[PDB]
Amino acid sequence: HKSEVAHRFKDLGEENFKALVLIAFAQYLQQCPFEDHVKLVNEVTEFAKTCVADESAENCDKSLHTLFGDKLCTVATLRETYGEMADCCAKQEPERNECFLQHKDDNPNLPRLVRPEVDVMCTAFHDNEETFLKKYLYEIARRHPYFYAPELLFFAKRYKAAFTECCQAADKAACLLPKLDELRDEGKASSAKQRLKCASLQKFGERAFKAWAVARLSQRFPKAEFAEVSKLVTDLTKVHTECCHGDLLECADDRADLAKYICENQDSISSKLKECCEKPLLEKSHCIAEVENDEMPADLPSLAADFVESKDVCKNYAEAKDVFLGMFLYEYARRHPDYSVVLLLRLAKTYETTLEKCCAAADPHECYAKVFDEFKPLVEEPQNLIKQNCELFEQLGEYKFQNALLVRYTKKVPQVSTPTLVEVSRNLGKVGSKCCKHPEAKRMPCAEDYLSVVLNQLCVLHEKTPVSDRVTKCCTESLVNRRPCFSALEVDETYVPKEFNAETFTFHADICTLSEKERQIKKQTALVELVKHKPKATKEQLKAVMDDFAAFVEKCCKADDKETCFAEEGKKLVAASQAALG
Numbered sequence: 001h002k003s004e005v006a007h008r009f010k011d012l013g014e015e016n017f018k019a020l021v022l023i024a025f026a027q028y029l030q031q032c033p034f035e036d037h038v039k040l041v042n043e044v045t046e047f048a049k050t051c052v053a054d055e056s057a058e059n060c061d062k063s064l065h066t067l068f069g070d071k072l073c074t075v076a077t078l079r080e081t082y083g084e085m086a087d088c089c090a091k092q093e094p095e096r097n098e099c100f101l102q103h104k105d106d107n108p109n110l111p112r113l114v115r116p117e118v119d120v121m122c123t124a125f126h127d128n129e130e131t132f133l134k135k136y137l138y139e140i141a142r143r144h145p146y147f148y149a150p151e152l153l154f155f156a157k158r159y160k161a162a163f164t165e166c167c168q169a170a171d172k173a174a175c176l177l178p179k180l181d182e183l184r185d186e187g188k189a190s191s192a193k194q195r196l197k198c199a200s201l202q203k204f205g206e207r208a209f210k211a212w213a214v215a216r217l218s219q220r221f222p223k224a225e226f227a228e229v230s231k232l233v234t235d236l237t238k239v240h241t242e243c244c245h246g247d248l249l250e251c252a253d254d255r256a257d258l259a260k261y262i263c264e265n266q267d268s269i270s271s272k273l274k275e276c277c278e279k280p281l282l283e284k285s286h287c288i289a290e291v292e293n294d295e296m297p298a299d300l301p302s303l304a305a306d307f308v309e310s311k312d313v314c315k316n317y318a319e320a321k322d323v324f325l326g327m328f329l330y331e332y333a334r335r336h337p338d339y340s341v342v343l344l345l346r347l348a349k350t351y352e353t354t355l356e357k358c359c360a361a362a363d364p365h366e367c368y369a370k371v372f373d374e375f376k377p378l379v380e381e382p383q384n385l386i387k388q389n390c391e392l393f394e395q396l397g398e399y400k401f402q403n404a405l406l407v408r409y410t411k412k413v414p415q416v417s418t419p420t421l422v423e424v425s426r427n428l429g430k431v432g433s434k435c436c437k438h439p440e441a442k443r444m445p446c447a448e449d450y451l452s453v454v455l456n457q458l459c460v461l462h463e464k465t466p467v468s469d470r471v472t473k474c475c476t477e478s479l480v481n482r483r484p485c486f487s488a489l490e491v492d493e494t495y496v497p498k499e500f501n502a503e504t505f506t507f508h509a510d511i512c513t514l515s516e517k518e519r520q521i522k523k524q525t526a527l528v529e530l531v532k533h534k535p536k537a538t539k540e541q542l543k544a545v546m547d548d549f550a551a552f553v554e555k556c557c558k559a560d561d562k563e564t565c566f567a568e569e570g571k572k573l574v575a576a577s578q579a580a581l582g
């Protein structure tokens with residue numbers, strides 16, 4: 001078209017356009033105040049209006065990058081505030097935009113955003129719905145300059161829905177609080193997965209990423225042909241490369257193109273893309289990204305046919321290794337939506353190591369004849385962990401299950417910081433209550449998704465302040481061995497316990513008036529500290545101590561004289577427990 005702005009304005013709609021422009025500016029000028037971004041938005045919107053009325057109006061012909069940069073270079077304090085960035089204004093596009101990208105600070109130093117009280121929240125929402133939402137949108141956008149703008153807007157509307165429904169409720173807190181926590185965790189998970197995918201693309205290269213994509217895409221679209229799946233894997237890879245570089249406009253267009261491509265070839269890909277494809281421009285991508293797996297053909301052959309028997313195997317493999325291997329992935333992955341993607345990759349890698357060390361020997365057909373027998377234990381390892389851990393999770397509840405993990409992991413890597421152990425364990429705990437609820441068919445994909453961020457999170461922390469070569473080992477290994485490596489950790493035989501510390505095991509009647517989340521974190525913290533002092537303690541010896549402690553919290557949070565009870569009965573507990581634990 002003659003005018004890009006006019007065009008975007010038209011299919012985006014005034015509301016969406018204003019919110020995205022706001023997010024876009026907040027992600028670059030992370031230091032400017034809200035009121036100043038609001039002024040920019042209005043001027044840009046006003047300008048956009050002009051181009052809608054007359055495509056040929058002054059400056060309407062210029063591209064989005066160009067218009068964005070000139071307005072960005074409009075800020076008078078650019079140099080005094082952003083310094084180096086102001087120098088970007090001296091060069092011409094595309095260098096200018098490229099220059100701006102390099103100065104976007106991923107982790108700026110802004111105070112943590114605190115959650116105000118439900119009533120001040122609900123009142124602000126009522127008295128001025130828009131500024132309340134645009135202000136937080138801004139605060140969130142400046143802290144996460146790389147979070148895909150449209151997705152951030154998508155979260156904003158769910159937040160609005162949560163305030164509309166909950167602020168009219170009798171008990172606003174019972175309604176609103178659990179929704180905010182869910183929203184928050186979900187957002188944090190989306191950011192981590194986004195950062196994770198880009199990191200992975202960097203370290204392991206395109207091949208590994210494409211492999212992951214083939215397996216992922218063939219589980220969702222088991223009916224699409226391999227050539228279609230390859231086409232999508234290609235564009236999907238260009239899209240992520242471009243979106244990871246951080247250029248919003250380029251990323252958005254790449255996603256829109258890919259979204260429409262899929263919709264126009266709907267019948268040739270999946271039967272579940274119906275809804276997603278009749279939605280507005282701004283939502284297609286997101287929807288398609290979250291679609292459910294289509295049903296498989298059920299009239300599908302046996303993998304063994306074309307991959308084990310057929311004597312044409314090494315010939316087909318030598319002619320195009322990656323293609324053949326991709327086909328293997330596609331074929332194995334679309335018959336197994338129940339496998340985690342990394343499991344599919346472990347099988348693909350194993351098959352690869354076999355074809356290599358078998359196509360270079362006498363009679364191929366006999367060397368690789370039993371490959372499928374090596375798959376069996378690879379498949380069963382994760383499954384066994386799911387049943388085993390999910391059973392235990394039912395015997396105990398979420399909380400007691402978390403404690404079990406705490407005892408198990410503290411013994412594994414005693415070197416790790418207590419607060420880290422507690423946090424990781426609690427998160428592992430959730431994964432249990434959020435995945436064991438599904439039927440066996442979806443349990444593994446579930447755990448993989450959740451475990452991938454929890455694990456990368458853990459690794460990053462350890463990255464900053466390393467404390468164990470073993471953790472570092474598991475953390476710097478390939479993405480397919482990460483989880484198995486952590487599972488293989490054994491109790492630390494060399495670890496030398498910490499000396500007793502009265503304080504660490506002293507507790508006042510503070511825990512009585514704390515919220516469940518607080519009471520637990522405190523009990524769990526002492527628990528990690530307990531195992532660190534006496535790591536050779538039995539599951540029993542420990543259970544006994546956690547027992548005396550359990551009641552102890554009752555006999556003191558229910559006695560007319562707290563503090564005294566806690567300090568009197570507390571002396572007993574420590575003395576007795578110390579003896580039981582020799």
Ligand SMILES: N[C@@H](Cc1cc(I)c(Oc2cc(I)c(O)c(I)c2)c(I)c1)C(=O)O
Pocket residue numbers: 182185186188189192423426427428430431449450453454
């Ligand atoms: N330690 C945090 C709590 C927290 C627990 C989990 I478990 C978690 O991980 C996921 C992963 C996926 I995938 C999801 O869809 C969701 I929702 C949460 C995240 I992020 C945060 C705190 O209390 O501050």
Ligand SMILES: CCCCCCCCCCCCCC(=O)O
Pocket residue numbers: 207208209210211212214230233322323325326329345348349352478480
């Ligand atoms: C469409 C061609 C891409 C398929 C490439 C097949 C590679 C299979 C090996 C598994 C990859 C895991 C990543 C890795 O360990 O390098």
Ligand SMILES: CCCCCCCCCCCCCC(=O)O
Pocket residue numbers: 216217220236239255258259262285286288289290
């Ligand atoms: C995941 C964000 C990228 C959005 C790309 C939309 C294109 C449709 C492919 C969606 C298939 C899901 C595969 C995946 O997890 O990336």
Ligand SMILES: CCCCCCCCCCCCCC(=O)O
Pocket residue numbers: 403505523524526527530533545546549550573574577578
């Ligand atoms: C040196 C030993 C001192 C004894 C310290 C006791 C700490 C154990 C707290 C564990 C709490 C288990 C949680 C629960 O009661 O449900």
